Amino acid sequence: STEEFGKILLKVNQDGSRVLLRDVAKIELGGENYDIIAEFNGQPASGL
Amino acid sequence: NKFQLTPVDVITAIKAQNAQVAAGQLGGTPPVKGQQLNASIIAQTRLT
C-alpha cells in the first residue's frame, strides 16, 4: 500500500529522527506510463 | 603503472564515458497544467 511505502525508513538522522519515505515524496497508485490520454465522448476511458 | 591505474579502471572509465543515457523529457508526462514546452532530454551518447 501507499502507507507501507510511506513509512520506508530512508535514514535515521543524527539526533535520532527518522527520515521516512513519505517525508520526501507523494505516494499514489498511478499508471505505468502517462503518454496516452484516452477519451470516449470527452470522458476518461480505458478499453481493449 | 606509472599513473597507478589498472585495466579495471580503464574498463570502468569506458563503461562510464562510453554510455547511452535515458534522460527523460522537458515537459515530460504527466505534465503540469499550462506547460508550453516538451522536448527530449539528450544526456550522454555512445562515443563514435
Binding site: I36, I37, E39, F40, G42, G47 | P31, N38
Partner: protein, 48 residues
C-alpha cells in the same frame, strides 16, 4: 500539431474535434474515441 507541442495543447484540439462530432453531426455520430499521444505518423505529445 507542430513540433514541441504539449499534451494539453493537443487535448483542446481533440476536445474541439470531439465537440464538433457530438454537435454538428449529432444525428450521425454515436461516439468519439480520442487518443492523445499516438497518431499514424508516429508517437509524441503533439499527435493524436
Amino acid at each position: 500539431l507542430p513540433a514541441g507541442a504539449t499534451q494539453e495543447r493537443t487535448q483542446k484540439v481533440l476536445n474541439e474535434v470531439t465537440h464538433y462530432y457530438l454537435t454538428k453531426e449529432k444525428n450521425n455520430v454515436e461516439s468519439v474515441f480520442a487518443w492523445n499521444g499516438f497518431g499514424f505518423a508516429g508517437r509524441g505529445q503533439n499527435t493524436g
